[model samples]
Target: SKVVVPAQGKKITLQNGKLNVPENPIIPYIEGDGIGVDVTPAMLKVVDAAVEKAYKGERKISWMEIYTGEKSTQVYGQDVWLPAETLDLIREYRVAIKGPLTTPVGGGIRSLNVALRQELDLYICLRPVRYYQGTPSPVKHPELTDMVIFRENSEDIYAGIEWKADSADAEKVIKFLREEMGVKKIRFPEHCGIGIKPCSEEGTKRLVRAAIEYAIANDRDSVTLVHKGNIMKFTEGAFKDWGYQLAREEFGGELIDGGPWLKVKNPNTGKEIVIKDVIADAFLQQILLRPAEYDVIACMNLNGDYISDALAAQVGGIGIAPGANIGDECALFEATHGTAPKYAGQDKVNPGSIILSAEMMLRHMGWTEAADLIVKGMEGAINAKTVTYDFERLMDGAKLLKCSEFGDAIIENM
Candidate 1:
C-alpha cells in the first residue's frame, strides 16, 4: 500500500465489530477534489484543536492522507481515480473522514462517493439533521426539525443497474420484459431505458435494525420507516414490511393497538420507542408541517437522498450538514455537500460540514467530551455572528470570515 502508517500512531482495530481506539489512532483522510482543498485543512485544524483541549495531550489523532477522485489521478495515474490501496488503508485503519469528491461527468467512475460506499459495504448512510443556533434557515422552527436519517447505502435505484436508452442492453431487457415476463409497461420500447431496483430482506433489515438501535441508544422517540411502498410494491413495499418484521422479531416490539405501528421499550431508559411507517411523499410534507413528530428515519437509498437534502434545507443547507457511511466494522465520515468546484481553492466556502463531520468521528470513537466541545464551539462561533459567506449573506450584522478563519473562530470559542 502507498499509504504510510505514522510512527507515533496505532491502528484502530475492531473488537466484535466495535471500534477500539488507542490514545493516538492513525486515521486515514481523503483530501477530496475541489473546495476540499480549502475546507479539509480547516476540518483538520478544528478537529485537532478539539482533541487537544478535551484530552490535554492524553489522546490525539494521527491523520494519514489517502487518495481518491481527481487527487488520486494526479498521485497514482491519469486513470486511477480510486486506488485499490486507498480502500485497503481505510479497511485497515477502521475509521476515516473526507471532504467532497467530484463525480465524473460521463466517464470512468459513476460517482467516487458511491464507489467508496459500495466498496466498503458501508450500508448505513447516517445523517443527523439539527439546527445550530444563529444559522439562517428557511423554516420558522428549525429546532423542531431535528432528525437522524438512516439511509440504506447499498440498494434500490442507486445500485446503478440501469441500461442506457437505445442501447443493445436496454432493447434486450425490454424484449425480455414484454415476451418472457409478459409485461407491457414500456411506453417507448424502441428507445426506452431500463433500471432494476433490488430491495432484499437482508439489506432492509440491517438498515432498519441500525435505525432502531440508534433510537434506543440516543433516547429517540420513534423510528419511522419512510418508503414509496404504495407504488413500488415489490421492492419499496417489501422494504417497509421487512423493516417492521425485523423490529418485531429482534427488538421485541409489540403491535400498538393490534396494528402496523409497534412500540418497544428501551432497555436503558425505559421509554417506549415507537416503530412506525409513513409513505415517502407524505413524510416529506410531514417533515415540513409536523417536524417534531419524526425523530429517526429509516428509508431506502433514493428516498433517503431526497429526504436528507430536503431536511437539511429546512434547518440550513447541505453546506453544514454532516454525514457518515457506516457498516458493522468500518465507517467513513464526510461532508454532506458537494465539492463546489467554482469555489475551489478560493477559501471562501464554509468548512462547517467537514468540521462537524470530524466531530461525529470523535463521538464514534467514544470521545464524547471532544465531540461536545465541537458543538459548543460551533454554536458559539455562529452565535457570535462570526460566519462564512453562506451564513453572513442571510444573517444580519454578521461578520464574514474565510473558511480557515471560521475554523479558527471555532477553536477560539472552544
Candidate 2:
C-alpha cells in the first residue's frame, strides 16, 4: 500500500520471481501528455472489454489512474512535471502502461520518457515490430519484417553527459583533455562541445542475454547484434562483441562454420537460433531489402533507438508501433509516437499504438488469451477497413473512425 497510490484496489505483485496477476489485478496507468486523453481511455475500454470477454465474470482489472507529466504538475504542484511519488508507485506496482509524454521544447528536464527509464534502470527498450494485414507499408513484403528489438536503455550518448559548445563545462573538459591527457585529435578544439559515451560490458551483456533467451523461448531463428562497431569500436563494437560472448558463454551457442557467427539449438523447438552481428549502417538497408534474415536484434542505446523507428516504417508507421521499457522486475508499456499536441484531445489520431502497447502489457502479465483477443480485434478492425485517420488516409475505400469509436470497432470485431 503505497502512500501515493489510490486506495481503491490491491497492488500488483511478483511471486516466485514472476508477475503474479490476480483475478482483479490493480494496474496503474499514466494518461501521458496530449492525445493521451483520447487513446488512454480508449485503451482502458478495449482492454477491459477483452478481459471481461475472456474470463466472463470470473476476472477483471482494477484500473488505477496515476499521475505524471502535465497531470502530475496539476496534482502535485508548480513545475513538478514528474513527481517522485509517481515513479515510486510505478516501481512498487512492477507493471504499468503509459501514453506518449511531451518533452518541453527548450528546457525543463531531458524528457520524462528518458528520465523514467534512467530512474528505474529499465535496461531493455523492447519494440516488437510486426505487420498488420491491410496496413499501409512501404516495403514490397512487409509481412516478412517481423523482428523484436532489444535496445540497451541505460547508456551511450543518451546518458545525457553533454556540454554545449562554448559552455563553461565544455571549456573545462576540452582543457582537461588537451592539457592533462595530451589528446590532440580535436580538429577544432576551441569551440568544440564534449559528450561522453559510456557503454558498459554489464549493460551490453544483460541486454543480449535477454534477447538470446527470448529467441530461444519464442523460437526465433536468429539474434542479430546490430552496431556501428567499425567506427565507434569500443562502445558500439564492444556491444556487438559482448552480445556474442553472452550467447556462447551462457546459452551454449557454437560456431556455425568455424566463424564468428554462432548458432544455438532452441531448447523448446530444437531448431538452430543463429547469433550474428551486422554493422548498423548496413543493417538499416538489410532490414529494408532482406528483412527475413533478421529476427531478434540486440544493439546499443543510439542504434536501437534509430533502428526501431526505421523498422516500424516498413510495417506501418510509428502511429501503430507499440513499445515497452523492460527491466528485470518493472515493465512500462507505451506508445512509441509523439504526444502530437496539435491533435490533443481531438479523438482523431490513431489509438493503435497505445492499444497495441496494452496488448503487449497483457502478454507480459501472462494474459495471453486476452492479448490474443487484442490482436484478433486489431486484425479484424483493419481487415474491415474501419480505422482511424492515420490508417484511413493511406488505405483506399477505408472507413474513418474517431479514436474512441476505433476502440469500439476493435471490441465489436473481437
Candidate 3:
C-alpha cells in the first residue's frame, strides 16, 4: 500500500521521454527464480561497487526489489506470477534489470519472461556476444567473434496464438484451414493443436531498422538477416524481403550484384556496411567456421533466440551472456540464461550474466564511466582465472570462486 522507495533514495523518472536519473535514483529489479537467489545479490553488489567507484560517493543506485515469476506469486496471490502493478512500476521507472526466471514445465503456465516482454511491447531482444580473454571457450579464436544480435521479441509461434488439442477453437481452425485454405497436412486433425505464426512487415521493418541503425552508429562491419525464409515462405520469407526493402528505401542501401543483398554507408563514419541475408541452417555453420565475418545479426523471434544462445556458446555459455528486452520507452536488462534450479541458493553459478546485464543498464542510462568500470572489472576477474564453477571446470589451473566471491573479485579488479 505504500509507494516502494528506499529510505535514502528517490524514484527514477523519465524526462522528455528519456531516462532522467538523479544522483541516487531508485531502480527496480526482479530477483528472478532458482539461481537468482545467488546471482542477483552478487550482481547488485558488483553494480553498487562499480557506481561507488566511478562516482566517488556522488552517484548511486538505490535498488528496489520488484516481484515477478514465483516471487510475484508469493507477494500477490497464488497464481499471480506477474502482477499488473509490477508492469506499471517498470513503465513508471523507464528502465530496470532482472535475473533469470523459471518457466513452468508441462505447460501449466507460459514463461513470465516472455509475458513481460510481450506486455511491455519490448520487441527488441538485444544480445551482445563477445569473448573475454582467459575465459574458457570451445572456439579456437573466440576473440574473433563479436556480434550484437537484435531478436524480435514478439510475434512468431511464441506469440501465444495457439489452441489446445481437441479444443473447439482448434477444431474450428482446422476446419477453416481444410476448407478455405486447402490445407491437408494435419496428420491428426481429430486431436490436433493449432498455433499461428504471425510475422508482420511492420514488426520486421522496425526490428531490422534498429539493427541497421545500431551497425551504423557503432561503425560495425555488416548486418546479417538470418531467417528460415526458404521454408516458411510468407512469414519468415517475407521477413527477409521486408528487411531488405526497409534498408534500401530508408537507409539508402545500394543493391549488390543486382540482387537482394545491399551495401550502405554508415552516416556517422562514412564507412561501408553490408546488408546481407543467410538461411538459418547455413548461418549456424558459418558462425562456427567463420565467425569474424558477421558483425550484427537481425532476425525474427524464434531464429534470434536459437542463434543468440548458440552463438553465446562459442565464446561462453548463457551463464555469462547478457541481454536486454527493449522498446521505445522502456528497457529491461536481464541474464540470458535460464533459472538453474539445481544450483539455486547455492552461492554457486556465474553471476557474470546479470552483472554484465547491469553493465548494459549503466550504459543505457548514460553512465558510461560506471559501465566501463564494470567491463574492466569483469576483464580483470576473468583474466585472473578467478571464476565460478562453469569456467573453472573448463580452464586448467583456474580457481573456482563462488558466485559472491566472483563479484568481489570483479570489484577488486575494478
Candidate 4:
C-alpha cells in the first residue's frame, strides 16, 4: 500500500510458475545504499536507453521506486532497515532489480540480502561470469573462465543456526551433544561457538535441477557439482550424491563411461550434456588452472559464495559481477559487490555491476534483444578503452570516465 503504482503500467504476473510480463510492466527497484545513489541512476538510464532503442518506445519499464537498506530507515522510521511494504511490492511485481544494500553493524538484522532470500524463498543464487574484452584481467586467458554458477541459496551453514562463544546457550548445546549424543570431536569444549549445517535432499535437488535446466536451455557443455564431500560427508557429500541422482532420475541421464559421471541428451539442441563433480578444493584449483573444463556449477551456499568471488577475480573483480536470487515465482537481480560507503553520491564508482544485473533481468523477462544490446554496449564501451577508474588504472591508454559518463558511453555504443 505504501508503494505508488504507475498509472499506465500493468503488474508483472506469474502464471503456472512462469513469468507473464506486459509491454509496460511495473517493476519495483531498490536504489540501495552507499554507492547505490550513484550507480543506480546510471543503471536506470542505460536500461531505459536499451529498451527504447530495442523496442522503439512500444515497450518500456515503468520503474516504481521501493525503499530498503539505509533508505528504508530514513523513509519508514529511525531503525527500520527493510520495510514490509517493500517486500510486498516486490512480491506483487514478481521480478525486481536492485543495487547493493548495506549490512548493518552489530544488528537487529544479520544481513538484509540473506533475509530477502529466506523470506522470499529465493533458493537459486545465479552468477554468470565471463570476460569483457579490454577489461584488465589477472589470468592469461580470462575468456576461458566463462561459468554460470547455480548456488544453493537457502541451506547449509548459512542457515544462521549458531550460538555465540562463551554464552549459556552454547554451553547448554555443548553439554547435550557431549552427554546425550556421545560426541567427542570438540577438542576445546569450553567457551566454544556452535553451528549447525543442514542440507536436505529437496534443497539439493531443486538447485541441481535449475543448473541442469539452464545448461540445456543455454546449450552449455557441462554442469559441475562442486562440494567438500571429503570432510563434511553428510552435508556437502550428500549434495554431490543428490545432484547426480537428480540428473539420472529426472533428466534421463546415463552413465558416461562406467559410472559416476552422467551424460544427458539435451532435448532442445540434441547436444550431449555432461554432468560431473569435483571436490571443492580441487575445483578451486582447477578453475584457476583449467577453467574451460567447468561450465554451470552447482554447489552448497558457502562453497558457491567462495567459488563465485574467486571466479570473479580472474576476469575482473566483483566490481562488475552480477547476481540473481531466483525462485519459482520471484526473481531478484542485484549487484554482487557491496555498497562502498566512501564513494556514496560521488558519481565515481563503476555502474557495470547493476547495469549487467539489469541485463540479466531483461533476459529473464524474455527480452533478449534488449539484453543483447546491453551486452553489446558493454563490449563496445570496454573495447573502446573508455571505462571507469577501476579499469582505467590497470589498462594503458584507457580513458577515465565518471560513473554517469560510463553509462552514457554504453548508451552511445548501443
Candidate 5:
C-alpha cells in the first residue's frame, strides 16, 4: 500500500533510469521541520477532502510520508538532514509537497531546501499572491492585486556567495575590486570575508522561460522581469538581456496566438506572437503603481524572495503566501514563510501557507477538482469572516479563531 524508502539510496538520475509511474501515480512527501508538523497534516486532510468532494473519490491523491528534520536527526544521528533514501523516492515520484523547512542555524547544513533545488535543477520559484475577503491587508487596493512571482532559484547570490571576515579569498576579492573594478575603497570587519555574485544566461533563460510558460498557460497579459542591471551591469545586466531573449525566442508563438490581440499575437491566422520584457527595478514600481497591468514575473533569487514577501504583505501577510519549488521532472510545493519554530505545535499560528501551497501542488498534479475545492473552501471561509486572530482585529467585530480552528473552518467550508 505504501512505497517505503530505501536506505542510503542514490537519488534519481534520469539520464539512465526508465521512468516508472502509476496510472494513478503514487507520490511521496515530507512533513517539514518545526511548525511544519502542524501545517502538514492540515494540508493533507484538506487535500483528501477536496478530492473526495470535487471528484467523489473518482480521482484522488495517495500520499506517502517521508521524514526530515529533528525527527530524522534523532533517529539517524545528527549528520542526516536529508537521507539519500528520501531523495531516491522523490526521484521515483515526480511530484511532492512540504511545509517551511528550518535551515539549520549554523554551517552544519547548506539548506536541504537549497540542495534539493540545485540537485534537481529546480530553477523556477513561483509564488502567487491574491487578496482574500476578511483577511487583513496593508493595502487598500489589495483586491486589485493579483500577480505571480517567479524567482530564479538556482543562481545569483543565492549560489551561497561568501568570504569569512578573515580569509584569503576575501583579501584577493577586495584587492581585485579595488585594483581592477577601480573601487578605491574596501570595508572590512577584519575577519576574512567572502563576496560572490554570479548570474549566468543559462540560469536566467530557464527562469524566464518558466514565467513565459505560466503566462501562456494562464492567458496572462505580460511577464515582468525584475532586476537591478543598471548598477550591477555584468550579472544583473545580463539577467535583463536574457529575460528579453527568452520572451522573444521561446514564447514567440504564444504572443501571436491571437490577432486583434494587437499582434500581441495574430489572433486570426495564429502567426508570430509578440513577447515583451521590463527591467527589474521598473517592474518593482509597476507592481505597486499598476499591478493589474502585470500578470506574472520572473526574477533572481534574492529579489524574488523580497518581492514575494512584499506582495504577500500587501495583500495579507507571509502567512498567506503560497510557493512552489519546481523542476521539469520534479515539483515540491512549500510554505512560503519561515519555519517559526517558536510557534511550533501550538496550533496558534496560521497554516494558510501550507494549505495554499497544497492547493498549488494539487493543480500541478493535474487534480483540478481537488485544487478547486481548496480554493472554494478558502474563499468561502474568508468571505464568511471566520478567520484567525490575525484577521479579526481588522474586521467588523468578528470572532477570532485559533489556527487549527481556521483549518477546521476551511474544511467545513469546503
Candidate 6:
C-alpha cells in the first residue's frame, strides 16, 4: 500500500505516516517559482499553527512536500522544469497544494499549469473568492465579494486547438465560411494563425454540475452558468446550454423541487426552471459593477481566467486570489497569480493567496473549525492594517509587518 508507480508521464507513490494520515490521503505539494519561495514558508507556518491549534490534542496534517516547477529545476536540472517524479507524486497522492510558478520561459510548451490540469483530467478549476478585512481597495463595499467560481478547466481555447492560418483545417473552415456560408470581409494571416476552442458536453456539464451541487450542499442561493451563448451560440453558448442540461438531468431534484423532491416546490420560481445563466462578457462586467448580486459562477476556462483575476484585482490584487483544481475526488489548491521573480526570497512578499489557499485545503479535509479560526485571524490581521509589504503601501495607514511576523500574528490571533 506504500510504494510508487510510474505511468502516464507521472509517478504515483503510496505511503503512510507517523501521523497515520489516511493511506491514500497523501498530499503532493509543489513550491512554485519566484515569489513562491516567500509565500510557501509563510503559508506553511500559518497552516501548521492553525491545524495544531484546532486539533490541539487530536488530529494533525502529514504534509509531504513533492517538488515540481522551479523547485524541481533545482532538484533535477535547469531543463527539468517539471519532473516525472513530481507528477507521479501528484498522481499517487491525488491531492496537492502549490505556490505560483515561473512557467519556464525557455518553453517547449504553452502552460505548465494547463498541461497538468489536462493530463490529470482535473476538469474543474475552482476559485473561491472572498473578502479580507482591512485590505486596500477602491471598491466602496469590499466585503460583498465573497463567491466561488467553478470554471471548466479542460476545454475552450485552452484545448490548444490550432491550425496555421493557411493550414488545412483553417483553410477548410475559411473556405466553407466564404463559399458555402458566403461570409464577407474575411481576413487571414495568409501564412497560418492557430487556435481552437475545444468544449465537450461532458466538460461543460461537470463544471456546472459541481457548482450546483455546491449550492445545494452549502445552502447557496443559486448557481449561474456564465457564457455568451447568444452570439458564439456554439462553443461558449453551447457551454451555457450544457451547464443547464446537467442541472436538469443530474440535479433535477434541486432543479425541479425548491429543495428536494421530498420537500415542497420552490416558492421562488413559478416556472420550475433551474437557477441559471448570464452571457460571459456581461457577467464579467457584473462581477465588477455589482459583485454581491451574484454568488456561485460556473464558466468556461478562459472566461474564468479573465473573470477571477479581474475580481481579485477589484478587492485587492493577485496577492489575494486563491484557486484550486478539483476532480471527482482529488483536488489541488494553489496560488492563482503570476510568479513575481523580482520579489522571490525577498521575505517581503504577501502570503495571503497561499495562506488562504491552505485555509481552503483545511476546509477540504473537513477541518472547518480550524479553517474558520485561521480565516478570522487572517481577516483580523488584515483589517487591523498590520500586514507585509503587499498591503502595507496600499493602505494609507497600515502597520508594516514582515512575512514571518504576519504568520506569527495570525497564530497569535487564532
Clashes (backbone N, CA, C under 3 Å), per candidate, total: 0, 0, 0, 0, 22, 9
lDDT winner between 4 and 5, please give it: 4
True-structure RMSD, every candidate: 1.0, 1.5, 1.5, 0.9, 4.7, 5.5
- In the range 1-414, model 4's lDDT, one tens digit per residue, is 566788999998888978889999999999999999999999999999999999999999999999888888888887989888877777789999898898788775788999899888999999999988778998899988889999999999998999988999999999999999999989999979999999999999999999999999899999999999999999999999999999989999999889789998999999999999999999989999999898999999999999999999999856999999998879999988889999888889999999999999999999999999999999999999999998998999999999999999999899
What are the lDDT scores of the predictions, listed in order?
Answer: 0.92, 0.88, 0.89, 0.92, 0.73, 0.73
Better of 1 and 2 by TM-score: 1
Pairs that collide in candidate 4 are none
| Tens-digit lDDT string for candidate 2 (355-381) | 999999999999998999999999999
User: Model 6: runs farther than 4 Å from truth?
Assistant: 1-26, 164-185, 253-274
**Residue 190 C-alpha lDDT in model 1:** 85
TM-score of each: 0.98, 0.97, 0.96, 0.98, 0.86, 0.85
Q: Cα deviation of 308 in candidate 5 (Å)?
A: 0.5
Error of 3 at 220 (Å): 0.8
Q: What is candidate 6's lDDT per residue for 1-414, written digit by digit as tens?
A: 122332222322334421223412445567788888878888878887886777784555556766667777676767876677666666666668998876655475568888778777788888887777667887887788887888888888888877666678888876776789887755653564657677788777767767776776666666777887787888887887676666657655353445322111234433232466777878887887888778888888888888888888877756878788877545788988778888777788778888888888777766788789888888788877788887887777888888778887888788
Model 6, C-alpha of 367: deviation from truth (Å): 1.7
**Candidate no. 2 TM-score:** 0.97
Residue 386 in candidate 6 has what lDDT?
A: 81
